[PDB]
Design goal:
Two copies of one chain form a homodimer. Chain A is α/β, with parallel strands linked by helices and 531 residues long. Chain A is built from 19 helices and 22 strands. Chains A and B meet through helix 7, helix 8, helix 12, helix 14 and helix 15 of A and helix 6, helix 7, helix 11, helix 13 and helix 14 of B. The structure holds dihydroflavine-adenine dinucleotide (2 copies) and glutamine (2 copies). The site of one glutamine has 5 residues of chain A, from helix 9. Chain B: Homodimer.
Chain lengths: 531, 537
């Protein structure tokens, strides 16, 4: 018995961690020279200890925890338990979703304000009546999303699936089409009992999410609200990893080596050695070499699997459709090393201090979201590194064209655009920021052969029609699909962990069911249902 | 009336900007074209393989034109693409138009779906029963089902063009909040003649429609785009044409036409970074364009820059209203990639598969659910003594192009090799050959991702639901006290077509003449049409 784990991301490392705790031989195959996958920390040369930024995962809305690292039940409990399992609980530092001092900025339609100041951002001129403005985007979206989210939260807490069954009856809706054809405002809002216009819906998307978010599945909007802790009775502890998210996969890998990795070997084929023999082993071609395994746990993204020769893996017609149709979403990040943390110590062109510690600013300008670092803020060498832009959907697609061109002329265009946008958001001059710029690093997860997209971001119908097919194995039960796409926590580490739990669960179920009690004891009776 | 210093700055030497200059030159209106790159044509982009023959090129962007019928003199019947046909005739290119074979001119192209291979027209179900598609839906077929849903909208829009009305568009806009998917999921009911249950299609069935009708993710964009695409494809009959030597001949011929009298020089290699009024408080303020680090002043400006490109330009002092500035961000663009491969021979025309069956393909296309999605065999040069050895091995849209894009333009040999092997493998499975049969014949590969290109920032406009009804009209109004005119194919209902760019230039110039020199309108109408879209009378 020997399990081939494809991909040394967090999902594959977690799978190996489970298999090692159960004394199951395994081997991890990784295409690159690095572990962590979309846990990717870039450290700027010539910078200080905290002059890094996380190009992928950077923030974890964990449940509350005690002094020993025991976490309350919650959406992200499995992530917290993983930290504690690895002895990392005390290495978790606060992540400030909002600024820890003065609030971050909002810059929309040329109107600048602080978060919480109640600006309308010229919405009346956009055709938003005063009643909608008074209610606000947040309350409106909560009224539409809340009912679905509460039912899904009840599923997790009460161990039911009726909430998901109801979500799936509405899975053909995008968030937009739900607002356009189904949602009617709560009578307490005192609004007309009619569906919102596209103008109003686009106003919601502008301040609620990203350009084009609402054209993807309504179910994803509901699941994101649950992941961000906008529903339920428990509160979240926003955390990040001291030194960058890379510490998590590096710590797991070091744990596994003291007891295994095939690096620099990209998988090009997966299939049964002989599809007609019932006891046929799996064959993985990686780095031009054939490797045999009893079972294979794949954590490769779905678009990557579409580049792998899966003949003799005997996918059924639904599984093969799912690999193509289950939708991914894009994302870009731009990190800038400055000479100082001007957002914390500086002032705008009028002498007003920014007074920002951690937190984020938002704008309809191309950069969309600015994320100020929470790590190291209280040390004697605070971070000088800013996430100048963090984009999703259309905003990331458009910005991606200026990233990774390899041409200085477009690198200069990109920097000038980002600094110009930053200047407008914070009310400074361009040169004030240019004089302080040291280095720029940019990344497009939608222009990366190892991800082929930032993460799963399902369109309408994906969850109800195609998602379950990939939780069934292929290759006569010997190929198991895992990775964050195989979860209801897309674009989160916990999604990858859930997928690894289910894949190993199915592996143990068909090969050594006597290990299930210990599996349940160490890693949970269920992937998602709360303890 | 018109000031003596009138001069229109045209931003972008693509087909929209070249057409604008052609109109203005015919009306004796001074202009100047500012272009960021060292080439003209924009998304008319022909790649010539150096080691190949005369017809060893492929069009990375525009390549096929569903024109109306035409007579021997180059007079085109009324139709969606008449404006394109007349442009060809105006430039003396009518006889340089050669057939474009949308379907193969000999044996049909291939379909390869769910591991089942068949020829177009053979009536295969591609294992759809295993997918849960009942026999009634299969017997009807995807094409008839889609036509039943799209037909009513398309017929109303065609009636608009022919009868010179807008009720068809107004009715389309009543449904513009629908994506194609949400329309099928929540509104469409099958025609009683189909004998199907009077219920909305399931997601499984809708995804079956998208699989064979368009591209992965197409149906999540606006229903209106699906309707407008069916109209553009001619669903009067169309004469599919392409341009001998590649689509680059069209913009090259316009540039030569504008240059004949020794003037109308183009400002090349000058990327626009700012557009605005010199003094937004003065009513007579001229426009200022900063391009290549130089300030240039114009009375009016016609922009053909893509909407995502305008979002990288400093538009302070252009005084866009709140709707216009929202439109620049939200009006959605779509992706596309193409992969051209020079082979040693036109094996699709002369070769045979692993079982000895000849492909016998001349022009036309093959389709598959594999990553390459669409294969396009060349129609140009097929009858000459040196036919093309160049294949469009992959032409993708939406999700298929987004995924494939990650393998294009990486700059690393290892990913160039991965890409080639994937493409050849897909091609081998589509045509029923082995990988090595195609590898032995491969000479050179060229790949392009219009969604990773600073000059386009997307392949073309591909609006989401609500874009046409909410934000589209805002950009047909000028900005900058009437002196900034938005043009380019995004400013049309023929997105992803040359005619869209031409329509946008007509409307922009029409608005310029309307506010600056109305005496030129009769000649403008005479030479370039009384309306942008309405059929000629
Ligand atoms: C921009 C951005 C931002 C965030 C996030 C993602 C992104 C892209 N996420 C999500 C989180 O990063 C993600 O869900 C998981 O890291 C995914 O882990 P997997 O193991 O599923 O895949 P992942 O892609 O990480 O790992 C797959 C592995 O397979 C390898 N591989 C690829 N092709 C191969 C081939 N052919 N052969 C062999 N190996 C191959 C890759 O190199 C990689 O090592 C996140 N999460 C969170 O909790 N908090 C957050 O704040 C964020 N934010
Ligand atoms: C892959 C693919 C395939 C097709 C098509 C497109 C694509 C991408 N099309 C659509 C057609 O190609 C397209 O609609 C028009 O060529 C667009 O012409 P525009 O003038 O609107 O823009 P276009 O993008 O062509 O021109 C804009 C110009 O502005 C320049 N520019 C950009 N940024 C600038 C800056 N900052 N400053 C100055 N200049 C700047 C660019 O370099 C370019 O010269 C098509 N159509 C058709 O009829 N038949 C077909 O078969 C196809 N197929
Ligand atoms: N849908 C998502 O949650 C994507 C965002 C990502 N999880 C983040 O924390 O930024
Ligand atoms: N929507 C579209 O028409 C995109 C396709 C493109 N016009 C072509 O025929 O190649």
């Amino acid at each position: 018995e020997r399990v081939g784990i494809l991909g040394a991301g967090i999902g594959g490392l977690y799978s190996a961690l489970i298999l090692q705790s159960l004394d199951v031989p395994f081997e991890i195959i990784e295409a690159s020279n690095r572990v962590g996958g979309r846990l990717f920390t870039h450290k700027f040369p010539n910078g200080g200890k905290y002059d890094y930024y996380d190009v992928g995962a950077m923030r974890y809305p964990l449940p509350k925890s005690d002094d020993k690292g025991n976490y309350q039940p919650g959406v992200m409990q499995r992530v917290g338990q993983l930290f504690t399992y690895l002895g990392m609980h005390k290495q978790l530092i606060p992540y400030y979703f909002k600024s820890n001092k003065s609030p971050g900025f909002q810059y929309f339609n040329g109107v600048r304000a602080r978060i919480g100041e109640g600006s309308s951002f010229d919405a009346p001129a956009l055709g938003i009546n005063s009643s909608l403005i008074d209610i606000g985007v947040t309350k409106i979206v909560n009224d539409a999303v809340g009912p679905f989210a509460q039912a899904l939260f009840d599923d997790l807490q009460k161990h039911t699936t009726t909430g998901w069954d109801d979500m799936m009856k509405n899975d053909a809706y995008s968030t937009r089409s739900y607002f356009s054809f189904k949602y009617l405002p709560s009578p307490s809002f005192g609004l007309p009992s009619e569906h919102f216009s596209t103008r109003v819906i686009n106003w919601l998307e502008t301040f609620d999410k990203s350009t084009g978010w609402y054209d993807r599945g309504l179910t994803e909007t509901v699941l994101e609200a649950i992941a961000f802790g906008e529903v339920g009775d428990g509160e979240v502890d926003w955390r990040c990893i001291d030194g960058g998210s890379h510490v998590l996969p590096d710590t797991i890998a070091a744990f596994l080596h003291k007891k295994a990795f095939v690096m620099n070997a990209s998988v090009t084929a997966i299939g049964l050695e002989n599809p007609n023999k019932e006891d046929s082993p799996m064959v993985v071609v990686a780095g031009g070499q054939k490797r045999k395994y009893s079972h294979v746990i794949s954590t490769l993204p779905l678009p990557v699997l579409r580049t792998v020769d899966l003949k003799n893996s005997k996918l059924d017609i639904v599984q093969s459709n799912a690999l193509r149709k289950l939708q991914y979403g894009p994302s870009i990040k731009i990190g800038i090393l400055f000479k100082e943390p001007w957002w914390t110590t500086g002032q705008d062109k009028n002498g007003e201090k920014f007074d920002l510690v951690g937190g984020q600013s938002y704008t309809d300008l191309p950069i969309r979201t600015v994320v100020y670092p929470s790590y190291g803020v209280n040390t004697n060498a605070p971070s000088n590194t800013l996430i100048a832009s963090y984009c999703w959907t259309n905003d990331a697609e458009r910005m991606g064209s200026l990233i990774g061109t390899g041409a200085a002329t477009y690198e200069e265009q990109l920097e000038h655009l980002v600094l110009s946008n930053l200047a407008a958001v914070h009310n400074t001059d361009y040169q004030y920021l240019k004089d302080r710029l040291v280095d720029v690093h940019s990344w497009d997860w939608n222009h990366n052969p190892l991800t082929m997209g930032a993460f799963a971001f399902f369109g309408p119908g994906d969850f109800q029609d195609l998602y379950t097919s990939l939780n069934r194995p292929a290759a006569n039960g010997k190929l198991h699909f895992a990775g964050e796409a195989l979860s209801v926590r897309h674009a989160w580490v916990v999604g990858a962990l859930d997928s690894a739990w289910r894949a190993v669960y199915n592996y143990l179920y068909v090969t050594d069911p006597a290990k299930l009690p210990k599996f349940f004891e160490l890693w949970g009776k269920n992937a998602e249902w709360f303890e």
